[PDB]
Structures are given as structure tokens and as C-alpha cells.
Paper text:
Three subunits, Cac1, Cac2, and Cac3, form the CAF-1 complex. However, the lysine/glutamic acid/arginine-rich (KER) region of the Cac1 subunit has been implicated as a possible second DNA-binding domain (DBD), as CAF-1 lacking the WHD could still bind to DNA.
To gain insight into how the KER region binds to DNA and facilitates CAF-1 function in vivo, we determined the structure of the yKER at 2.81 Å resolution. Crystals grown of a maltose-binding protein (MBP)–KER fusion construct contained four copies of the MBP-yKER per asymmetric unit. In the structure, we saw no evidence of interactions between yKER helices or formation of any tertiary structure, consistent with the definition of an SAH domain. Inspection of the sequence of the yKER reveals a pattern of opposite-charged residues, lysine/arginine and glutamic acid, that are three or four residues apart, capable of forming an ion pair network. Such a network confers stability to the helix so that SAH domains can be completely solvent exposed in solution; such as in the well-characterized Myosin 7a SAH. The circular dichroism (CD) spectrum of the KER showed characteristics of only alpha helical secondary structure, including the positive absorption band at 195 nm and two negative bands at 208 and 222 nm, validating in solution the structure of the KER observed in the crystal. We noticed that the yKER SAH is particularly enriched in positively charged residues, unlike the Myosin 7a SAH.
Numbering used by the authors: 3 to 477
The structure:
Amino acid sequence: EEGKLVIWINGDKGYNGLAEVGKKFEKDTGIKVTVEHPDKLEEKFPQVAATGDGPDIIFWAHDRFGGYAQSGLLAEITPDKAFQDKLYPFTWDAVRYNGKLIAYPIAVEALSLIYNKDLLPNPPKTWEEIPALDKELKAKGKSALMFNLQEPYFTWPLIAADGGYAFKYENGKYDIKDVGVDNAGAKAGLTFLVDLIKNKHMNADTDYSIAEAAFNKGETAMTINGPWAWSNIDTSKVNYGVTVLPTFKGQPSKPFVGVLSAGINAASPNKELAKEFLENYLLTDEGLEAVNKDKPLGAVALKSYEEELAKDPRIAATMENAQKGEIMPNIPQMSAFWYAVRTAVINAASGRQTVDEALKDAQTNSGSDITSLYKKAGFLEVLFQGPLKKEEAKREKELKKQQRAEEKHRKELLRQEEKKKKELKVEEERQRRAELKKQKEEEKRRKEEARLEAKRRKEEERLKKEEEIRLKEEA
């Protein structure tokens, strides 16, 4: 339908703020803007867009946007050099598929180093200081660092710090035949990761839940997580800080960068209108603020608005780690990379393979046939369909108990503050009467004290003249 903008954005984002920016776009141009949040739009959009229908604009991470363009679902955006300068240069690389821009960057997301301020006022700036910092904290019944070691997304920051990379990115493209997994840099990064486990500084069987709980309970001093986990730490009432990830051999850690992007439908009749909306209404200070006020975006690609968000050290550390991080490729071959590195880490942490053997097979399995891997996943999904469907229900059973625990926390924080605001309001009215009665009393006691001195002088002048005439009259 030409002449009307339809926007699809996930339900966990600030869509109400996005609708307000749409109403502002409608108040100026008269074009209706309807912001919807359908369920599972990452899988529903690729089907509706292929048949012509669908939204004019769709919001989602840039990783899925790669296959969208290969399918022909996203139109090539055309921002001028002026607007390209409004966003950080590295964010455009995440929305560039096949050398052409196919999405507008909105928000930037990357892993950071979260530390307990009560245990560590000064967090370590280097990975080499953690072994000695853990030996110190082990004497006091705690540990230094505990983060997810199962998925390679959490272990890549250390593995790629010395010179690792998924696929080499050049001229705006990706070389599936050039995987940077078994080089001298990745070998040192993974060796130091394994040496941390062999020296009993980390346990190889630590996943996401084990790490999130150990930090919330105050048992470990540090953890590695993204802005999505800040809510869970706020409920634990742990004085935590979000800082830059440690360096390894002088080089900073390289976490994968995820960019929330807004793409224009390739079959949309309102491509020019979507361009006016995204560049001149959404990607502005007033626009992004309306969305961030409804649901925080974290670090955003807009420079002018990142300055104000960067006053929050947590968002400032996320953008710093993102700029030092690695743009996550949107190439479908990435699936082979995820599976290859996953087994490379697990086999190296369990002693199945050495660091050299694990990375050697990983660089080979990264170039594995993707369709063969998909069929391999289909065979295992059916083979373990029972325990898997029970695991998914258990995670949904714990997510409802973990979102009710947050609702109970903000209910507690809203109750104590609303009661403290009325409690101080009573004291302000208490001393207001206590000082009003003190003013009425002290002002009328000093006033009468002046009448005491004036009347006493009148008495002194009257008794002295009455005595004067009483002595003058001699009998």
C-alpha cells in the first residue's frame, strides 16, 4: 500500500517511543505510520516480504540482514556523506552486505567486563593480572572471574585479542575461504584460556546460568556479559561497574559487535518515505531519545546522542568495547564458524585436543558445507527431540520466575521510594510548624523584652520625680 509506513520491530524494544516518532512524522507530512511488534518477525518477515507484502521498515540485528539481501528482501539505502558522518564509521560495516548498504545502524551492542566494586575498586586492565588476582581472592573464599565458556561468543574476546578473526573483511565483503582461527594470535589467546582452567582459575563446565548466578550472589569478583544482563544485576543489589575488557599481550579484547539495524523492504513502494523517516526523524537526538525513554537502547550509532548516553559509564564501556571489537559477519557461512569454534574450545578445555589440534580442525570445519551441517542439526534435533522440548519448557518456566522476580524488585524499589518521599514530606511539614511556632514565640518574647526596658526607664524617671517633689515640699 503506497503512501503509508508500516514498521515491524520486536516487542522487547521501545516500540511505543518509536510510534511517537511516527506520530511526529505523521503530524508534519500527513503520512500514517503504524508501528507493530509481531511475534517472531525474524522468521515471519522473510516469508511475507518474498510475496511482496510486509512492512516498509523492519528492525533487527544486522546478522540476519545478510541473508535478507542475498534473498533480495532489503533495498539498498542511499545516505549522503553528511548523514554517514552522523554515525560512527565502524557501524556502517555491519550493515554493508556485498559492498552495498542495506540497513541503517541504530544501536551498538558488545560484551564488557562487569566487576564488583566492593571486591575490586580498580578492575584489572590486562588478562595477565587475573591469575594472580584469583589466587588472592581464593584465600578469602571467592574467585576472580567466571563467565560463559560453552558458547564461543563469550570466549572469542580473548581468543581473537592477539590476532584472530572469523572471516577476513575487505572492501566491504567477506572471504569465506579466509578464516582466521588457527594463527599465532588465536593460539595464544586460546592457550591462555586453557591455562586458566588447568591452573584451577576457571572451571571448564561453566555456562551462562552458572556465571550469572555466581556474580549476582557475590561469589565471583568479575563476569563478562552484555547490556541485556544489567537488569539481573540490578535486582541482586550488587554494587557493580561496567568497564572495558582486559587486554591480552597489549592488544584489546575483540568481542563480536551486534548492531540493531533498520532495513527498508526491497518491494516497498515507500522507500523514499522510509528514508526521510529514518534519517530525519528517527536517527535524531529527539527521535532516539523518544525510543530510549520507552526502552533503553544502550550504545547508539548516532554520535550526537551517544555523547549524552556516554555519561553513563556502562554505555560508555559498551561502545568502547564495540569500537575495539570485531563486527560480527552476516555471511551464512558463519554457522559453520560458530559450530567449529564451539567444539574447538570444548575439546581444548576437556583435554580431548591440544590448542593446536582444536584450532586446526576449527579452521577446516569453518569452511564446512553449510547444508551438510543443517542436516546434521536436523538429525540431532529429532534424536533428542524429547529432552530438548523439555529443556525449552524449563527455560520458559525459569524465565517466568525470573521476570516475576524483577517485577517484585521494581515493586519493592517503587514502594520504598514512594514511602520515603511521603516520609520526608512529613518531616518538612513537621519542622515547618516547629519553626513557625518558634518564630511566633521568639519574636514576641524579644518584643516584650523591649517593653520591659522602656517601662523600667519610665519607672526610673517617675519614681525620681515623685521623690523630687515629695522632698521639695518641706512640712
